[PDB]
Ligand binder design. Structure first.
Ligand SMILES: *[C@@H]1O[C@H](CO)[C@@H](O)[C@H](O)[C@H]1NC(C)=O
Ligand SMILES: *[C@@H]1O[C@H](CO)[C@@H](O)[C@H](O)[C@H]1NC(C)=O
Ligand SMILES: *[C@@H]1O[C@H](CO)[C@@H](O)[C@H](O)[C@H]1NC(C)=O
Lengths: 123, 108, 241, 327, 48, 108
């Protein structure tokens, strides 16, 4: 019943930067871990990044290391993702899934998911 | 590294049949695998967390089992609202939250 | 925060006649058209009941609890706000607090550090205690609330249980009969031997509206209660009067 | 038959002509009804057991529970809670026996230290982290938390006191970070030679065996004081049946009789009703605010009309004060 | 009889019944080893 | 562990004397000690089992006492066949049935 609203999607040229916002209101956000994952238009799901309940332990996907950064605002119960140095392969769908646990690297997986937002990287 | 394989890709059945899907791992993950159902029209949702723990709020028709390398999910009722794609994800090995290939399920 | 009041005008407390007030339902039993004899802690007919006025009369004395207290208030515009019970009224012992602010009725059991002159002062200045150390019981209850209101209360403490009987009537003490309906049962389990009332001052320094209340002490005696056919007590007879 | 009943009553083999009173006709109950008010105001055990993050074993979390109904069957009905050891009280009778206050102690331990949470046990946890009294009245629960408290890089958020100058008292929490004095020379706050920090970190990982996986432990220490106990279990309520001679339990009140709809209007506070003869005749249902008359199950006195047995053995039966439709 | 029935390592020759569905009748001997059921789900022969 | 000490080793008396022998334990054993008489020419025999319980068939002259860490045996009559070696044994500590040193008794 929890709500996960995502925005920031659109069409941008390769090499530009943008922001994605994911806001949650149906649960307590101060003690849950959150993750960004990627579903390709013609392939399966892939994990991208995630943050814990507090901004101490942080992880990124190997294919996106050094390019993407995440931020978390517990005051307004939301998180942001900065899209930098975009290339032709980043035109997929992105979800904002909620981890069952509190840390970043735990055997507990994502509990509740949100509707994906479509981004396009082309001229 | 870790490698995941999906033996079935597309399957055919009816309303009153029984279907089984399997997911195999290159190395044993101590039964730390999760199953996700992804409707084409909405956001994906989890069905089974862990080896054989059913997530509360979904029908008990889905059943997860298997430990070690190969794991199995089973549907006994096949309700006409089960048109989605099933994914298996491991959460034990060093590659963080790597997902497997899709598994198309349809009835004919 | 505590503030001492030095604007009091010294007058002795008044005395008046209790008449036939202070009768309440002894238990939870329904009786119809039966006269029943009950031995309990009651208020005798036609005695001293002590009378205090508030208007710069500021009657906030500290009275012994004895075996039970009958507190009547001939009131309008919500001047009386609560009560304080305990043995030492300090953090040394356990204290009980009943308040009814502008929002709701609050019951607390804590080691309050009560002010020498606690009161309430829109009403947004509460000077009742400076600290609360050990709180063992909390309770939120519904709001209990020409002089127009007569509010009669009976406070008793038996076997660690605090019983509050209440009655509201639209109107010296008026002459009439009215059974007090039981309101609150509280499992507190503390020793209570003394108490103080809590008033509200209107700030314009401060002005106090016209108010008057009466205090009586209960003792064990036997009454004969008459129940009508509706189960409502209509008359009582004091067997020892 | 009534003739033989008369012979039994009179202690004679011959019955003279006349009318004799022998015994009574009383209907027997068949169903038993037990009633209590709605099971509301549940104790917040979800915040204790289903909490996302527990505290360390040295700083074990203590929660006081009172003034609510505690459903111990919920904890008894969850499969993942593998370890349920209780001492000083039977687990089956936890639901009925009423106590004053509950203390929930939550912490995290490893495998080899699970057994140390028990009266009379010893170890690092028993001596320096969590001490259990010998006369401990309560239960302990331990469950695996490898999926939550383990990280591939390692979870260092849990700590345990490994060194102390003395063993902890029962139900004592030590959170001091003073440097342990292991040598003659004063430490002066520096963990140098013969000086060690008393707290060590549990580096939980998902690749550990059963003896090293992180396990969440909640200990319920149960106390009853001179104050009226307020922690009760859920009281089951039997479905109401009416219009028949039944056994009823109304708020601890035993009785036997026919329950019928009543026209009396009980006052909101009024609970029980008594008739002229100082007997319980009306009751208010604890769940639905309705009034019920309790009539005694059909009463009759049986009299026998018979000529002398020297004449004939035929008899007649008279039920006193009973309408002919109630036999 | 602490001199005869006590072992320093521990004596286990003595056992007592802890759970039963009903109270025993006077002078009744119960040697049944059936698994006591306190839940709704039947035991089905497992002490689980 | 546990250590038992015999304060006296050889004692001399007459046929009409009274003798006492003490056995001390390293720590408390809760009155769980036994006293044995060992004739040099035949099999040794038990005199006292438990702290102060007299074994059947032996004369009541012997008397045992003491609890905690120290224990004592006393003979009041000293009959001329009471020449033997007396041992104290503990049966409470983790070392199973450890015996103390001998205590020679001679009459003179
Ligand atoms: C109240 O007691 C006083 C004495 O303190 C007495 O003078 C007075 O008569 C009493 N009240 C009544 C109504 O009699
Ligand atoms: C009792 O109640 C009935 C109906 O509710 C009413 O007619 C009657 O007047 C009541 N009795 C009294 C004394 O008010
Ligand atoms: C108790 O629950 C029933 C329905 O299950 C409801 O009808 C009844 O009103 C409840 N009790 C109270 C006091 O509201």
């Amino acid at each position: 019943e929890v709500q996960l609203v995502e925005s920031g999607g659109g069409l941008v040229q390769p090499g530009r930067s943008l922001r994605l916002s994911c806001a949650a209101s149906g649960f307590t956000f101060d003690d849950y871990a959150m993750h960004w994952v990627r579903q390709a238009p013609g392939k399966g799901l892939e994990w991208v990044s995630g943050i814990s309940w507090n901004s101490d332990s942080i992880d990124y996907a190997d294919s996106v290391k050094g390019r993407f950064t995440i931020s978390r605002d517990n005051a307004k119960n939301s998180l942001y993702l900065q899209m930098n140095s975009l290339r032709a392969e980043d035109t997929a769908l992105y979800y904002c899934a909620k981890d069952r646990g509190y840390e970043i690297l735990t055997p507990a997986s994502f509990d509740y998911w949100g509707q994906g937002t479509l981004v396009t990287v082309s001229s | 590294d870790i490698q995941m394989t999906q033996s079935p890709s597309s399957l055919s059945a009816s309303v009153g049949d029984r279907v089984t899907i399997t997911c195999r791992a290159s190395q044993s993950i101590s039964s730390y695998l999760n199953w996700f159902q992804h409707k084409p029209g909405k956001a994906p949702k989890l069905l089974i967390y862990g080896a054989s723990s059913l997530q509360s709020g979904v029908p008990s028709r889905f059943s997860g089992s298997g430990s070690g390398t190969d794991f199995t999910l089973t549907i006994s009722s096949l309700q006409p609202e089960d048109f989605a794609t099933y994914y298996c994800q491991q959460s034990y090995s060093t590659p963080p939250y790597t997902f497997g290939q899709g598994t198309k399920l349809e009835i004919k | 925060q505590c503030v001492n009041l030095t604007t009091r005008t010294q007058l002795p407390p008044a005395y008046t006649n209790s008449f036939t007030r202070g009768v309440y339902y002894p238990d939870k039993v329904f009786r119809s058209s039966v006269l029943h004899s009950t031995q309990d802690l009651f208020l005798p007919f036609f005695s001293n009941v002590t009378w205090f006025h508030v208007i710069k009369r500021f009657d906030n004395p500290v009275l012994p609890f004895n075996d039970g207290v009958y507190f009547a208030s001939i009131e309008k515009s919500n001047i009386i706000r609560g009560w304080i019970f305990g043995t030492t009224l300090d953090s040394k012992t356990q204290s009980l607090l009943i308040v009814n602010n502008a929002t709701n009725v609050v019951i607390k059991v804590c080691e309050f550090q009560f002010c020498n002159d606690p009161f309430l002062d829109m009403e947004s200045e509460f000077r009742v205690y400076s600290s609360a150390n050990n709180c063992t019981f909390e309770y939120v209850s519904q709001p209990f609330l020409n002089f127009k209101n007569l509010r009669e209360f009976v406070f008793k403490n038996i076997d660690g249980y605090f019983k509050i009987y209440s009655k509201h009537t639209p109107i010296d003490l008026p002459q009439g009969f009215s059974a007090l309906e039981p309101l609150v049962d509280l499992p507190i389990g503390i020793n209570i031997t003394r108490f103080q009332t809590l008033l509200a001052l209107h700030r314009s320094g401060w002005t106090a509206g016209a108010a008057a209340y009466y205090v009586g002490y209960l003792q064990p005696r036997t009454f004969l209660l008459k129940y009508n056919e509706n189960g409502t007590i209509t008359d009582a007879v004091d067997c020892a009067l | 038959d009534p003739l033989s009943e008369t012979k039994c009553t009179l202690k004679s083999f011959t019955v003279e002509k006349g009318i004799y009173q022998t015994s009574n006709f009383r209907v027997q109950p068949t169903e038993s009804i037990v009633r209590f008010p709605n099971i509301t105001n549940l104790c917040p055990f979800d915040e204790v057991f289903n909490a996302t993050r527990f505290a360390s074993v040295y700083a074990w979390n203590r929660k006081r529970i009172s003034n609510c109904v505690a459903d111990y069957s919920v904890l008894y009905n969850l499969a993942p809670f593998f370890t349920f050891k209780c001492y000083g009280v039977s687990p089956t009778k936890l639901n009925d026996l009423c106590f004053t206050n509950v203390y929930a102690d939550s912490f995290v331990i490893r495998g080899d230290e699970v057994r140390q949470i028990a009266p009379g046990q010893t170890g690092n946890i028993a001596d320096y982290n969590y001490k259990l009294p010998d006369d401990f009245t309560g239960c302990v629960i331990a469950w695996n938390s490898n999926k939550l408290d383990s990280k591939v890089s390692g979870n260092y958020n849990y700590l345990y006191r490994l060194f102390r100058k003395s063993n902890l008292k029962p139900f004592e929490r030590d959170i001091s970070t003073e440097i342990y004095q292991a040598g003659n020379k004063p430490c002066n706050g520096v963990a140098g030679f013969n000086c060690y920090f008393p707290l060590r970190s549990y580096s939980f990982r998902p690749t550990y065996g059963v003896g090293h996986q992180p396990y969440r432990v909640v200990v319920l220490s149960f106390e009853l004081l001179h104050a009226p106990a307020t922690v009760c279990g859920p009281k089951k309520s039997t479905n109401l049946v009416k219009n028949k001679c039944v056994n009823f339990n109304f708020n601890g009140l035993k009785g036997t009789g026919v329950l019928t709809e009543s026209n009396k209007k009980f006052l909101p506070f009024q609970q029980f009703g008594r008739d002229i003869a100082d007997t319980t005749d009306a009751v208010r249902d604890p769940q639905t605010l309705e009034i019920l008359d309790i009539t005694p199950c059909s009463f009759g006195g049986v009299s026998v009309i018979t000529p002398g047995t020297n004449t004939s053995n035929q008899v007649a039966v008279l039920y006193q004060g009973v309408n002919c439709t109630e036999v």
